Design a protein around this ligand. Structure first.
Ligand SMILES: CCCCCCCCCCCCCCCCCC(=O)O[C@@H](COC(=O)CCCCCCCCCCCCCCC)COP(=O)(O)OCCN
Ligand SMILES: NC(=O)C1=CN([C@@H]2O[C@H](COP(=O)(O)OP(=O)(O)OC[C@H]3O[C@@H](n4cnc5c(N)ncnc54)[C@H](OP(=O)(O)O)[C@@H]3O)[C@@H](O)[C@H]2O)C=CC1
Ligand code: SF4
Ligand code: SF4
Ligand code: SF4
Lengths: 318, 382, 103, 328, 177, 122, 96, 153, 57, 24, 121
C-alpha cells in the first residue's frame, strides 16, 4: 500500500545515515569522510550495500533458517513499524492512534525480544551475554524514557502523537522542559546503543556481540535496524519536545512554512546531535551506564513528573 | 572462567593476546601472552656491526622511534668514550623530545580511542603527521629515522627545520589544550580512568615500572633529572609527578609531559650551537661525502666504518635513557670485535605489561583495555 | 623446582614422578586432542616410556632434571590447548642413500 | 631430474610442471606436492585471477607461476607449456556446462594438450588424470569421455602416464562435501541406488602423492595406466556411515531407486537449452554421476595399484576425513 | 583511609555557592558542553585532509623510497662493484656479483636489491662511495606479485635513469650535508 | 567534468582559484593554489586520464615539485634531465598483464630465463 | 480502533519488505565470486515493576484536569511508595 | 550482447572497489603508519576503506609489521574467516617479505607464507601515501576482476 | 566557510527522505480519499461519516 | 561480588611538579 | 600535621617519631647477633645510632627530616623496618666471616666515560 512510501524512503534514510554519520563524525575529526565513491560520497551507501550483497557467505547454513534468519527481520520490522504513528505533518501520520505513545512504548518492549532472541540464537556465550547486557540496558533506559514521556504527556492532553505535536503551538516543550529534552536525548542515546553509552557496542565487542552467522545480510540488517531505530528515537525527541512540525511561528515572508520540512530539519538536528555526541565523548563502560539509568535518569525523571504535574496542577494549566 | 581477550581494535594494540581469568565481569587475573611480536632482535644484533644494529632500535618502539636510537647511541658512546659536540646533543634532545611528543600524542589518544573518544585520536594524529614532517625532513623516513648514530647524529638539520619546528611549537600548546579540554574535564573520562589501575609506589618500584607509571605513584624519578644524559642538565623542565597513581594521573602526566617536552623543544631551538654535527673522531663517525671523496685517509675510514665498524672496546654497560614508554635501557655487552655481543634491550612494556596482572585485578573487563592504554604497551619492545 | 638431584637417586625418583604424571594425564590428552580413536592408551604409554628410556643413559643428575623439565613443559603445553593436535598424532642401506644425494 | 637441493620449499627438482587442473580440489594437493618437494609449477588458470591465489603460496617465489590460458584456444596452451618438462592434466568436469560439453572438457582437451605437448618436444613425463572405471561403454558420459581421453593421450603421445583415481575424498571435495550440507537437510541423506555401489575412494593427498611418485620414478610408469584406487573397498552407504561418525549427526538415510533419481536429475540436463542462464552446478543429483553410480565398476582390477609406486594409501577414517569436523 | 580521604575531599567543597557551582556543573553537563563546543568548532573548520592520488604529502630530498642505481651523465653505470652497500646493508637485501667487463673497468654482473628484505634505511646511499645507489623519492611501487618486488640485477634499479631528474636534484640539494 | 563518480570532483572543486603551473608530456596538469589556505593542499596534479588514473603517473621531473620536496616546476628540471640515458616514465604497470609487469631473470615468465648454475655443465 | 488497520497491514508489508531484504543477498553471489548473573534478574524484575508503575502513570497523565488536586495527591502517594521501594533498592544496592 | 555483462562487471567491481573494509592486522609500526593512513590527512574512510576490528566482515586484510612464527597460526585462522571475495595487502618489508628480520628464527619470511597476498605495499616503513597507493592498487586489482564474465565462462 | 555543506548533504538526502515519508503517505491517502487525513478522528466523526455517506444517497 | 569498585572520587587536580622548579 | 607523602601507598604516619624510636631500638638490639668484625654490623650500628639519636633529640617529624637528611620519616620508617627484616634474615643463612680461599677478583677497570651518556647525577 502506502507502507512502501514510508519504508522505502526510510530504507534510503538509513542507508544515507550510515554515510551521514561517517561524514559528520569525520568532519568533526578534521577529515572528509566518504568522498570518492559518489560525487560527495553520495554513492558510498550504495557501494557498502552492493558490496555486502555480493559477498559470498562464510558457510551456507541455510538449515537453521527459522531461528535467527527471521530475528533480524523482527528487529527491523519493529524499528520500521514504530514509524506508523510518527506524524510528519498535520494529517501525515499513517495511522493516528489515540494511544499512539503507549504503542511506541510497546514497540520498544518488543524490540527487547528482538535483541534477546537474536542474541540467544548466536551460540556464543560471550556474544549472548553481550546481547543480554544490551537488552538490559535498552530496557533500563526505558523506564526513564517512560517517565519522560509521562512528563510530556502531563503537559499534553492525550497520547495522540499528532496532539503532542499540536499541543506545542504556543511553545515547544523543549524550552520549558529543556532539562527533560537533555534526559530524553541522553536516554534515546542509551536506549538505542549508538551513544557515549555503547560498551556492548565497543568497536570490536559489537560485531562479535550480535550473531555468529553473519552472511552480510545479518550485519547490514542490524546496522540498518540501529540506524532506523536512531532515526525513530530522533523523530521522538522532535515530536514530543521540539515542535513536531511546527515552525517558530514568526510567519516569514521568505518562508512559506512547509510542515514536513520542519519535521525534517528538526530530526536532522537530532541526528547530527547523535553523531556529534558520538564523536566528542568517551564510552560509559556499562557498569557506570546501568548505574546512570537507575541512579541518575530515574530519580531525575520521577522528579520531573512530580514537578511538571505540580506546577501544572497548582496553577490550572492542565 | 577464562576469556581469550585479544586485540580489541587491531592496528592500535597489535598482538595483544591476554588470557583473562575472569569472575563474571570482575577480572581475577590477566595473563598476557608475549612473543607474537618477538622478532629475533636480541639475537639479530649479535650478528651485525654497531652501525647495522642502530635501525633495529627505531623498530623496537614503533611509536617513539628516536628515543631508542638515542638510548643505543648512548650505549656505544659509553664504551667508545666518543665525545659528541654540543649541536649533536641539542639536536639529539630536540628529537628525543619531539619523540616524547610523538609518543604521548599517540599513547594518549590511542588510549583515548580504546576508551571511546574517537576524535582526540585523529587530532593527535594530525599533530603526529606534522612532527613526521620533521622526522622525514631531517633523516628521510617518517617513522624509522635511523638518524641518531653512535657518534653524534647522522646529518645536520636542513636549513629550514628550526623555523618549522618553531612554527609548530607556537601552535602546539593549543593542540595539547584541545586534547585536554576534550578529555580532562569529561565526567565520562574521569569515570573511565579515575581509580583505574592504581599502583602504589612500592608496586611501581617492585615491578620495575620506571616510566610515566613510576611518576604516577608519586616516585619523583625521571632519568633526565636523575641521570642527565645530554643538555638535559642545562635545559629547564619540570617532571610532572602524580599523587594518586590511577590511570587518570598517568594521563594527566602524559598530557603535562607533553608540555614540558614542548618547553624542551623550544629551548633546544632557541639555544642550538652552530658546531659540528658528528664527533670529530673520524674512526667512529664516517666522514662526510665531500671529505671521503677528496681525502684518501677519510675514504679509508668511510670504507672501514661502513663495512668493518667501530670495534668498540671490550666492556659491558647499561645505558638507560628516559624513553617515552619509560626507562628504555640497552645493556650492551661488547666483545672487542666490531659486532656487539648480547645487546640486551631492557624495554618498558616488558616490565609494564607485567604490571597488567596486578593492575587489572578486580577491575571490570572493560577496564583491561584502559590499563593497556595507560601502560603505553607497544609490543615491539616486548 | 630446586634441583634436589644431588644424586641420580632423587633424579630417578622425580623421573618416575613425571612418568606417573604424564600417564595419569593421558586421559585429558586423548580428550582435548581426540586421539582416543587413532591411538590406544597402551601406545601412548609406550611412546612416553620410549621417550623416558631413549634418554635413560644420562649419568648426569642435572641433565636429567632439565630433561624432566622440558618434558613437563611439553606436557603442560599439550594438556592445555597451547599446541595443536596434528603433531600429537605424529608425536605418538648405504646405496638407498647414495641414490638420493651426496650427503 | 636436475635436482640441486635437500628437501623442498627452496630446492630444485628439474620439474617445471604445468598442472593444467591446478585450480581444483585435486590440483591444490598435487601442486603442493610438486612445489614442496621443490619444483616449479606453471599453474594455468581459466578465469578469475582469484582461482590460483591459494597456490601462490606453497611454492617459494616463482616455484608456482599462475598463468592465464583459454582452454579452446591453442598458441596459449603452447605458451603455458613453453618452459616445461612435466605436464600433468587435471582438466575434467562431472557436470556438463552450457559452454563446454562433456567431450569439450574431458576428452577434446586432454587430446589437445597431448598434441600441443607432443609438438613441444621436451615434455618428458605427461601424466593424464581420468576417473577409475573410465572405460568406454560406461554409462556416465563423463567416463566415456574420460576413456576417450586416455585413448587419445596414449595414441597421440605414448609413454604418458595415466592415473585412474577413483572418487577422491578430502577437504573441498565433490564426494563428501555435497553429502554434508545435505545432511543439513535434517540428517536426510539420499544415498542413490540403495548403496549397492562398490567404489574405492582415496585420500586426495595420496592421489597427489601417486601423481608425483610417477614423476620421481624412473623410465617406468610411462604409458602404464595406473588405478589409484585406495584401501577399504566401500559402498556408498558404508562411506556415509563414516561421515556421520565425524559430523555429529544421527544416520537418517533413505533409498532412492535409480528411476526416481534420474527423474530428480532430469532438470539441470537442459544445459545446452537454457542459453541465457547457467545452471548451479548439480552437486549431489547428477544424472551422469548417477549413471556411474549404477554399475559398481569403480573397483581396482588387476591393473597397477598404489603398490607399484612404493606407496600405500591412507585410510578413510581419522585425519583423511577429518575435514568433516567443520560441519559438526 | 580511603573512607577518610573521601570524607575530606568532600568536606573541601562544602560551602554553599560552591556546592551549587559543582551541582550546576554536574547536572547541566557543563564539562561536556565544552567538549561539544570544541568538537563543533572543528566540525566547521577547514579539513586537514589530502585527496591523495591528485596531491600527495610533503616530503624532503632526504626521503628514502625506491632504491635506484644512478648513472654517470655519460652513461656508464656509476656502480663500481666495491660491495660496500652489500656490506653495510642491515637486512642484506643487496646481492652483488662483480666481473671485469671487456672494457676492463670493474662492474656488477649481478646487483639485485631484495626490496621485500630491505629496511629503506638509506645506509646503501651513505656507504656507496660514488653515490651509485640512491633512494628515489618514488615510494609508490606496490607490486601485485612478490617476485616483481625483488628488484633484479642492475636492470630495474637501472630505471633510476627516469628518476635521475629528481634524484640529481635531491642530491644537488642534499650534498651540502 | 562529468565524473560524479570519483574524488576527481574534489580536485575539480579545487582549480577554482588555482593557477596552472605547467603540464608534463603525459598531459597531467600541475596546479598550484597558494596564499589562500590549507598548506599541504596547494600543489596537486590533474591526471589527464580521468579514469584509470593512479599515482606514479607523475614523471620524475614533477614528482619533486608535487611532493613539496623542491620548488622547481617540471618545466625547470626538464633542462636537467640527462639526454644520454634519460628514460620516459612507465606508470608502474603492476599486474596489468605479463610483459608489462616486471620479471626477474629466472621467473619463467621472463623471455630469456637465465640459468644460475655457476658450474658450466659438460 | 479504526486506525489500527493501517498498522495491522503494516506488520505484514514490513514482513514482506524484510523477506525481500533477506532474499536479495541469498540470490546473488553465485558459484564464482559465567554460571548466572542474577543482576540480570534484578534489573529485569525492577524494569517490570517500574514499567508497571509507568502503566499506572499513563491514565493519571492523560486525565489530570479531571482529577483536580485529589487524583494528583493520590498519584503522589503511589509515587512516594514507589520512591520508598526505589530507595530501598538503591540503598540495598540493586542498581549496580 | 556481452555489453550487459561488461557493465554488470563494472558495477560489481565499482562496489567492491568503493567499499573495501580491511581487517587491519596492524602488528608493529606499519600499523602506526596504517593509523596515519587512517588518520586525518590521508583519509582511508574517504576511499570507503573502513578499518574493521573483526575478521568476520572484511573485504581485505592489511597485514603489517613482522609476522612472527607465533602469530602465523593466528593470522591464518583470521584469514580463513573472511568472506570469499577477500584480498590481502602486505604492508611494510617485514609483512611482505622477510624484511629486516628475514633471517630471524621467529619471523616468517613474508606473510606470503601464510596467506595468499594480492598487493605488497613496498618500503619497510611505507609512507602513509605509499600504503594508500597500495590500496589504490588493490582497487585496480578489483577493477580487473570481471567475475560475471567468468561465471558465464 | 561553507565546508560543512559536504557533510550536510547526507543529512539533506536523509531529510529529503523523511519529507518523502511524510508527504507520500499523505498524497497517497489524499488520493484514495478526496480529503486529507483527519487526526483527531473520534467516534463522533466516524458516525457522522456514516450518516454523511448515507445522506448523499 | 565484593571486588573493590572503582570509586570515581579523589582529590582535586593540582599539577605536582618536582622540587627542581627554580634552583634544583 | 603532615598532610600526605607525595608517594602513593606510603601513608603518612602521625606517630612518626615514636615508631622510629621503637624501630631503631629494635634494630640496635637485634644487630647484636651478627659478629662484631663485619662491615654490616658497623654500618647498621652507626647509622641506626645516628638516626635514633636525631630522632630522640628532635621532636617534630619536620625537624627529624631537616637534621637527619634522609627524605621523609615515612620512607625512613620503611627503611628501618626493611633493615629489621634484613637483620632477622641475615641471622639465617649466616654469610659472615671470610672463607679460607676467597678468590675475589677486583676487575677494577677505569674507562673514561663521555658524560653525554647517562651515568647518573
Ligand atoms: C545532550 C547531548 C549529550 C550530552 C552529553 C551526554 C552525557 C551522558 C551522561 C551524562 C551524565 O549522566 O553525567 C552525569 C549526570 O548527568 C546528568 O545528570 C545529566 C553522571 O553523574 P556524575 O558523574 O556527574 O555525578 C556522580 C559522580 N559519582
Ligand atoms: N573430484 C572427484 O571426486 C574425482 C575427480 N577425478 C578427476 O580428477 C581431476 C581433477 O579433479 P578436481 O580438481 O576435483 O575437478 P574439478 O571439477 O574441481 O576441476 C579441476 C580443474 O579442472 C579445470 N577444468 C575443468 N573443466 C575445464 C574446462 N572445460 N576448461 C578449463 N579448465 C577446466 C578447473 O578449472 P576451473 O577451476 O577454472 O573450472 C580446475 O582447474 C579431473 O580430471 C577429475 O575428473 C577423479 C576421480 C573422481
Ligand atoms: S636501505 Fe639500503 S642498505 Fe639499508 S637494507 Fe635497504 S638496501 Fe640495504
Ligand atoms: S652501489 Fe655503491 S656500494 Fe654498492 S657496489 Fe656500487 S659503488 Fe659500491
Ligand atoms: S617492515 Fe619495517 S616498518 Fe614494517 S613493521 Fe617491519 S620494521 Fe616496521
Amino acid at each position: 500500500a502506502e507502507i512502501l512510501g514510508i519504508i522505502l524512503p526510510l530504507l534510503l534514510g538509513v542507508a544515507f545515515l550510515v554515510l551521514a554519520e561517517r561524514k559528520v563524525m569525520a568532519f568533526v575529526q578534521r577529515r572528509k569522510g566518504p568522498d570518492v565513491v559518489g560525487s560527495f560520497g553520495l554513492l558510498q551507501p550504495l557501494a557498502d550495500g552492493l558490496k555486502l550483497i555480493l559477498k559470498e557467505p562464510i558457510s551456507p547454513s541455510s538449515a537453521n533458517f527459522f531461528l535467527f534468519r527471521m530475528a533480524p527481520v523482527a528487529t527491523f520490522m519493529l524499528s520500521l513499524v514504530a514509524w506508523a504513528v510518527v506524524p510528519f505533518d498535520y494529517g501525515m501520520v499513517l495511522s493516528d492512534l489515540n494511544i499512539g505513545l503507549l504503542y511506541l512504548f510497546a514497540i520498544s518492549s518488543l524490540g527487547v525480544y528482538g535483541i534477546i532472541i537474536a542474541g540467544w540464537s548466536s551460540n556464543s556465550k560471550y556474544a549472548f551475554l553481550g546481547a543480554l547486557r544490551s537488552a538490559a540496558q535498552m530496557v533500563s533506559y526505558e523506564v526513564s524514557i517512560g517517565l519522560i514521556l509521562i512528563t510530556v504527556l502531563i503537559c499534553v492532553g492525550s497520547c495522540n502523537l499528532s496532539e503532542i505535536v499540536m499541543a506545542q503551538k504556543q511553545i515547544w516543550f523543549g524550552i520549558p522542559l529543556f532539562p527533560v529534552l537533555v534526559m530524553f536525548f541522553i536516554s534515546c542515546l542509551a536506549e538505542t546503543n549508538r551513544a557515549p553509552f555503547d560498551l556492548p557496542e565497543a568497536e570490536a565487542e559489537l560485531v562479535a556481540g550480535y550473531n555468529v552467522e553473519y552472511s552480510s545480510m545479518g550485519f547490514a540488517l542490524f546496522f540498518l535496524g540501529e540506524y532506523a531505530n536512531m532515526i525513530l528515537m530522533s523523530g521522538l525527541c522532535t515530536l514530543f519536545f521540539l515542535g513536531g512540525w511546527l515552525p517558530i511561528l514568526d510567519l516569514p515572508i521568505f518562508k512559506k512554512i512547509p510542515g514536513s520540512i520542519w519535521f525534517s530539519i528538526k530530526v536532522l538536528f537530532f541526528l547530527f546531535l547523535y553523531i556529534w555526541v558520538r564523536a566528542a565523548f568517551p564510552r560509559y563502560r556499562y557498569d557506570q551506564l546501568m548505574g546512570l539509568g537507575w541512579k541518575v535518569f530515574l530519580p531525575l525523571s520521577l522528579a520531573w513528573v512530580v514537578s511538571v504535574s505540580g506546577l501544572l496542577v497548582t496553577f490550572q494549566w492542565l | 572462567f577464562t576469556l581469550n581477550f585479544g586485540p580489541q581494535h587491531p592496528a592500535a594494540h597489535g598482538v595483544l593476546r591476554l588470557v583473562l581469568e575472569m569472575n563474571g565481569e570482575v577480572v581475577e587475573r590477566a595473563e598476557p601472552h608475549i612473543g607474537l611480536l618477538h622478532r629475533g632482535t636480541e639475537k639479530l644484533i649479535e650478528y651485525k656491526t654497531y652501525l647495522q644494529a642502530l635501525p633495529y632500535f627505531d623498530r623496537s618502539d614503533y611509536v617513539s622511534m628516536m628515543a631508542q636510537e638515542h638510548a643505543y647511541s648512548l650505549a656505544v658512546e659509553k664504551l667508545l668514550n666518543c665525545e659528541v659536540p654540543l649541536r649533536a646533543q641539542y639536536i639529539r634532545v630536540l628529537f628525543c623530545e619531539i619523540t616524547r611528543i610523538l609518543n604521548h600524542l599517540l599513547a594518549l589518544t590511542t588510549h583515548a580511542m580504546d576508551v571511546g573518544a574517537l576524535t582526540p585520536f585523529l587530532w593527535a594524529f594530525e599533530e603526529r603527521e606534522k612532527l613526521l614532517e620533521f622526522y622525514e625532513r631531517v633523516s628521510g623516513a617518517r617513522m624509522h629515522a635511523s638518524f641518531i648514530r653512535p657518534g653524534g647524529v647522522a646529518q645536520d638539520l636542513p636549513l629550514g627545520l628550526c623555523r618549522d619546528i618553531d612554527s609548530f611549537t607556537q601552535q602546539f600548546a593549543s593542540r595539547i589544550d584541545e586534547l585536554e579540554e576534550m578529555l580532562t574535564g569529561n565526567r565520562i573520562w574521569k569515570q573511565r580512568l579515575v581509580d583505574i589501575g592504581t599502583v602504589t609506589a612500592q608496586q611501581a618500584k617492585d615491578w620495575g615500572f620506571s616510566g610515566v607509571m613510576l611518576r604516577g605513584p608519586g616516585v619523583c624519578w625521571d632519568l633526565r633529572r636523575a641521570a642527565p644524559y645530554d643538555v638535559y642538565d642545562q635545559l629547564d623542565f619540570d617532571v610532572p609527578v602524580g599523587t594518586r597513581g590511577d590511570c587518570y594521573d598517568r594521563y594527566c602526566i602524559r598530557i603535562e609531559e607533553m608540555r614540558q617536552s614542548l618547553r624542551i623543544i623550544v629551548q633546544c631551538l632557541n639555544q642550538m650551537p652552530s658546531g659540528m654535527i658528528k664527533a670529530d673522531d673520524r674512526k667512529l663517525c664516517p666522514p662526510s661525502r665531500c671529505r671521503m671523496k677528496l681525502s684518501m685517509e677519510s675514504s679509508i675510514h668511510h670504507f672501514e666504518l661502513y663495512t668493518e665498524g667501530f670495534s668498540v672496546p671490550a666492556s659491558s654497560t647499561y645505558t638507560a635513557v628516559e624513553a617515552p614508554k619509560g626507562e628504555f635501557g640497552v645493556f650492551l655487552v661488547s666483545n672487542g670485535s666490531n659486532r656487539p655481543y648480547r645487546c640486551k634491550i631492557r624495554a618498558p612494556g616488558f616490565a609494564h605489561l607485567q604490571g597488567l596482572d596486578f593492575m587489572s585485578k578486580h577491575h571490570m573487563l572493560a577496564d583491561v583495555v584502559t590499563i593497556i592504554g595507560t601502560q603505553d604497551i607497544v609490543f615491539g619492545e616486548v | 623446582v630446586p634441583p634436589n638431584s644431588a644424586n641420580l637417586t632423587e633424579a630417578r625418583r622425580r623421573v618416575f614422578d613425571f612418568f606417573r604424571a604424564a600417564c595419569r594425564s593421558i586421559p585429558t590428552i586423548m580428550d582435548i586432542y581426540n586421539l582416543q580413536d587413532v591411538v590406544a592408551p597402551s601406545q601412548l604409554r609406550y611412546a612416553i616410556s620410549a621417550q623416558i628410556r631413549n634418554n635413560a643413559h644420562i649419568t648426569d643428575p642435572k641433565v636429567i632434571d632439565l630433561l624432566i623439565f622440558k618434558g613437563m613443559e611439553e606436557l603442560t603445553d599439550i594438556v592445555d590447548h597451547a599446541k595443536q593436535r596434528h603433531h600429537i598424532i605424529g608425536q605418538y642401506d648405504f646405496l638407498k642413500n647414495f641414490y638420493t644425494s651426496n650427503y | 631430474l636436475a635436482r640441486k637441493g635437500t628437501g623442498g620449499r627452496s630446492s630444485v627438482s628439474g620439474i617445471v610442471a604445468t598442472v593444467f587442473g591446478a585450480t581444483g580440489f585435486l590440483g591444490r594437493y598435487l601442486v603442493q606436492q610438486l612445489a614442496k618437494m621443490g619444483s616449479q609449477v606453471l599453474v594455468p588458470f581459466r578465469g578469475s585471477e582469484d582461482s590460483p591465489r591459494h597456490l601462490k603460496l606453497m611454492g617459494d617465489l616463482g616455484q608456482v607461476v599462475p598463468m592465464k590460458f583459454d582452454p579452446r584456444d591453442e598458441d596459449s596452451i603452447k605458451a603455458v607449456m613453453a618452459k616445461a618438462n612435466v605436464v600433468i592434466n587435471l582438466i575434467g568436469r562431472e557436470y556438463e556446462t552450457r559452454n563446454f560439453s562433456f567431450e569439450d572438457a574431458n576428452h577434446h582437451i586432454a587430446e589437445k594438450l597431448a598434441l600441443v605437448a607432443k609438438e613441444h618436444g621436451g615434455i618428458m613425463r605427461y601424466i593424464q588424470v581420468s576417473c577409475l572405471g573410465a572405460s568406454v561403454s560406461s554409462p556416465s558420459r563423463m567416463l566415456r569421455a574420460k576413456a576417450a581421453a586416455e585413448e587419445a593421450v596414449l595414441n597421440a603421445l605414448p609413454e604418458a602416464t595415466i592415473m585412474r583415481p577413483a572418487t577422491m575424498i578430502g577437504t573441498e571435495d565433490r564426494i563428501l562435501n555435497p553429502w554434508s550440507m545435505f545432511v543439513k537437510k535434517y540428517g536426510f541423506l539420499p544415498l542413490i541406488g540403495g548403496g549397492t555401489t562398490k567404489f574405492q575412494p582415496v585420500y586426495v593427498v595420496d592421489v597427489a602423492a601417486a601423481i608425483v611418485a610417477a614423476l620421481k620414478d624412473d623410465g617406468s610408469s610411462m604409458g602404464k595406466t595406473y588405478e589409484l584406487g585406495g584401501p577399504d573397498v566401500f559402498t556408498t552407504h558404508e562411506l556415509a556411515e563414516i561421515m556421520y561418525d565425524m559430523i555429529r549427526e544421527w544416520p537418517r538415510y533413505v533409498k532412492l531407486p535409480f528411476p526416481i533419481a534420474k527423474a530428480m536429475a532430469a532438470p539441470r540436463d537442459f544445459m545446452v537449452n537454457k542459453v541465457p542462464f547457467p545452471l548451479p552446478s548439480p552437486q549431489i543429483f547428477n544424472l551422469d554421476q548417477i549413471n556411474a553410480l549404477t554399475t559398481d565398476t569403480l573397483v581396482s582390477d588387476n591393473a597397477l595399484k598404489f603398490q607399484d609406486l612404493d606407496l600405500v594409501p591412507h585410510k578413510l577414517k581419522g585425519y583423511p576425513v577429518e575435514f568433516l569436523i567443520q560441519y559438526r | 583511609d580511603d573512607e577518610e580521604a573521601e570524607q575530606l575531599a568532600k568536606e573541601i567543597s562544602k560551602d554553599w555557592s560552591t556546592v551549587f557551582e559543582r551541582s550546576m556543573n554536574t547536572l547541566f553537563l557543563t564539562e561536556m558542553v565544552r567538549g561539544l563546543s570544541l568538537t563543533l568548532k572543528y566540525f566547521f573548520d577547514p579539513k586537514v585532509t589530502i585527496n591523495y592520488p591528485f596531491e600527495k604529502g610533503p616530503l624532503s630530498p632526504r626521503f628514502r623510497g625506491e632504491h635506484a642505481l644512478r648513472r654517470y651523465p655519460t652513461g656508464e653505470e656509476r656502480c663500481i662493484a666495491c660491495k660496500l652497500c652489500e656490506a653495510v646493508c642491515p637486512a642484506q637485501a643487496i646481492t652483488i656479483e662483480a666481473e671485469e667487463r671487456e672494457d676492463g673497468s670493474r662492474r656488477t654482473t649481478r646487483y639485485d636489491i631484495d626490496m621485500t628484505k630491505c629496511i629503506y634505511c638509506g645506509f646503501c646511499q651513505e656507504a656507496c662511495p660514488v653515490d651509485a645507489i640512491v633512494e628515489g623519492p618514488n615510494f609508490e611501487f606496490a607490486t601485485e606479485t612478490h617476485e616483481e618486488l625483488l628488484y633484479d640485477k642492475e636492470k630495474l634499479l637501472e630505471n633510476g635513469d627516469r628518476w635521475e631528474t629528481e634524484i640529481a636534484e635531491n642530491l644537488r640539494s642534499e650534498s651540502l650535508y | 567534468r562529468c565524473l560524479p563518480d570519483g574524488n576527481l570532483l574534489q580536485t575539480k572543486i579545487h582549480n577554482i582559484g588555482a593557477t596552472l603551473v605547467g603540464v608534463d608530456k603525459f598531459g597531467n596538469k600541475y596546479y598550484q593554489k597558494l596564499g589562500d589556505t590549507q598548506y599541504g593542499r596547494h600543489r596537486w596534479v590533474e591526471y589527464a586520464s580521468k579514469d584509470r588514473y593512479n599515482a606514479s603517473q607523475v614523471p620524475a621531473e614533477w614528482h619533486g615539485w608535487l611532493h613539496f620536496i623542491t620548488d622547481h616546476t617540471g618545466d625547470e628540471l626538464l633542462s636537467l634531465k640527462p639526454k644520454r640515458y634519460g628514460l620516459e616514465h612507465k606508470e608502474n604497470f603492476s599486474g596489468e598483464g605479463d610483459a608489462y609487469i616486471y620479471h626477474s631473470k629466472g621467473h619463467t615468465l621472463n623471455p630469456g630465463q637465465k640459468n644460475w648454475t655457476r658450474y658450466q655443465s659438460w | 480502533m479504526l486506525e489500527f488497520a493501517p498498522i495491522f497491514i503494516y506488520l505484514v508489508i514490513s514482513l514482506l519488505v524484510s523477506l525481500i531484504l533477506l532474499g536479495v543477498p541469498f540470490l546473488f553471489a553465485s558459484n564464482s565470486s559465567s554460571r548466572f548473573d542474577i543482576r540480570f534478574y534484578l534489573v529485569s524484575i525492577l524494569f517490570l515493576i517500574f514499567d508497571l508503575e509507568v502503566t499506572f502513570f499513563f491514565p493519571w497523565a492523560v486525565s489530570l484536569n479531571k482529577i483536580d488536586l485529589f487524583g494528583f495527591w493520590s498519584m503522589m502517594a503511589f509515587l512516594f511508595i514507589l520512591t520508598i521501594g526505589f530507595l530501598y533498592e538503591w540503598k540495598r544496592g540493586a542498581l549496580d | 550482447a556481452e555489453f550487459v555483462i561488461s557493465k554488470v562487471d563494472d558495477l560489481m567491481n565499482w562496489a567492491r572497489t568503493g567499499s573495501i573494509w580491511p581487517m587491519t592486522f596492524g602488528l608493529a609500526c606499519c600499523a602506526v603508519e596504517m593509523m596515519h593512513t587512517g588518520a586525518a590527512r590521508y583519509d582511508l574512510d574517504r576511499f570507503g576503506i573502513i578499518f574493521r576490528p573483526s575478521p568476520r566482515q572484511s573485504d581485505c586484510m592489511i597485514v603489517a609489521g613482522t609476522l612472527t612464527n607465533k602469530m602465523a597460526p593466528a593470522l591464518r585462522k583470521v584469514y580463513d574467516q573472511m568472506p570469499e571475495p577477500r584480498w590481502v595487502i602486505s604492508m611494510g618489508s617485514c609483512a611482505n617479505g622477510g624484511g629486516y628480520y628475514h633471517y630471524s628464527y621467529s619471523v616468517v619470511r613474508g606473510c606470503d607464507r601464510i596467506v595468499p597476498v594480492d598487493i605488497y605495499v613496498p618500503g619497510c616503513p611505507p609512507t602513509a601515501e605509499a600504503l594508500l597507493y597500495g590500496l589504490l592498487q588493490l582497487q585496480k586489482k578489483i577493477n580487473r576482476r570481471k567475475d560475471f564474465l567468468h561465471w558465464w565462462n | 566557510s561553507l565546508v560543512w555543506l559536504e557533510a550536510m548533504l547526507p543529512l539533506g538526502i536523509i531529510g529529503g527522505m523523511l519529507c518523502i515519508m511524510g508527504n507520500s503517505q499523505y498524497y497517497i491517502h489524499k488520493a484514495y480519499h478526496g480529503r486529507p487525513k483527519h487526526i483527531g478522528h473520534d467516534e463522533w466523526d466516524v458516525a457522522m461519516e456514516r450518516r454523511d455517506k448515507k445522506v448523499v444517497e | 561480588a565484593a571486588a573493590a569498585a572503582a570509586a570515581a572520587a579523589a582529590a582535586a587536580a593540582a599539577a605536582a611538579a618536582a622540587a627542581a622548579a627554580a634552583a634544583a | 600535621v603532615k598532610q600526605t607523602t607525595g608517594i602513593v601507598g606510603l601513608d603518612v604516619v602521625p606517630n612518626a617519631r615514636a615508631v622510629l624510636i621503637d624501630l631503631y631500638s629494635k634494630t640496635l638490639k637485634e644487630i647484636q647477633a651478627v659478629p662484631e668484625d663485619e662491615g654490616y654490623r658497623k654500618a647498621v650500628e652507626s647509622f641506626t645510632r645516628q638516626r635514633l639519636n636525631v630522632c630522640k633529640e628532635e621532636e617534630d617529624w619536620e625537624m627529624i627530616e631537616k637534621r637527619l637528611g634522609c627524605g621523609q620519616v615515612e620512607e625512613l620508617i620503611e627503611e628501618a623496618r626493611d633493615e629489621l627484616t634484613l637483620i632477622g634474615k641475615m641471622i639465617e643463612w649466616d654469610p659472615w666471616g671470610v672463607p679460607d680461599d676467597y678468590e675475589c677478583e677486583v676487575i677494577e677497570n677505569d674507562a673514561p666515560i663521555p658524560k653525554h651518556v647517562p651515568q647518573h647525577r
